[PDB]
Nucleic acid binder design. Structure first.
Ligand SMILES: [Zn+2]
Ligand SMILES: [Zn+2]
Ligand SMILES: [Zn+2]
Ligand SMILES: [Zn+2]
Lengths: 72, 72
DNA sequence: CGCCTCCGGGAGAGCT
DNA sequence: AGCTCTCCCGGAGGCG
């Protein structure tokens, strides 16, 4: 039921991991677009439905840590 | 709204032709399967929802004649 | 960003 | 086994 990256309600198993719609699309864009992000805090930011936009850096890291792979 | 091959409820436009979902996957498998297929009747089998299973030979023939190709 | 639609295709459950 | 067919998830394209 819950997204392993932000804990919004999960919409399926995406790129390997139980994930919400928005994190699926975010991850795809993050890898393909080869953006390189930057944490403005400690790399410890809180990623939930309310704060996930704030730190793409930590959100992307949480994505990686959950095991998201573009070709799972 | 009706599959151009078996007249079941069409699920959209697959490989060029308005078809149902089972005709989509059947055609793909037949083409790539490099398949013999011999009709047990006289190449005039009735292909509908309840009968499309019996004769791959006619189903495939009907698929091709409907314009299904693995390009579009 | 977060969401939509559309169609391709993997997979696995279930015949046969 | 081989075949059928639905469920689920992929990319592309587009949108506010
Ligand atoms: Zn999420
Ligand atoms: Zn951060
Ligand atoms: Zn059909
Ligand atoms: Zn036949």
């Amino acid at each position: 039921k819950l997204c392993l990256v932000c804990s919004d309600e999960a919409s399926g198993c995406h790129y390997g991991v139980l994930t919400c719609g928005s994190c699926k699309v975010f991850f795809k864009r993050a890898v393909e677009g080869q953006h390189n992000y930057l944490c403005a805090g400690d790399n410890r930011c809180i990623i939930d439905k309310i704060r996930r936009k704030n730190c793409p850096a930590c959100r992307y890291r949480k994505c990686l840590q959950a095991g998201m792979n573009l070709e799972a």
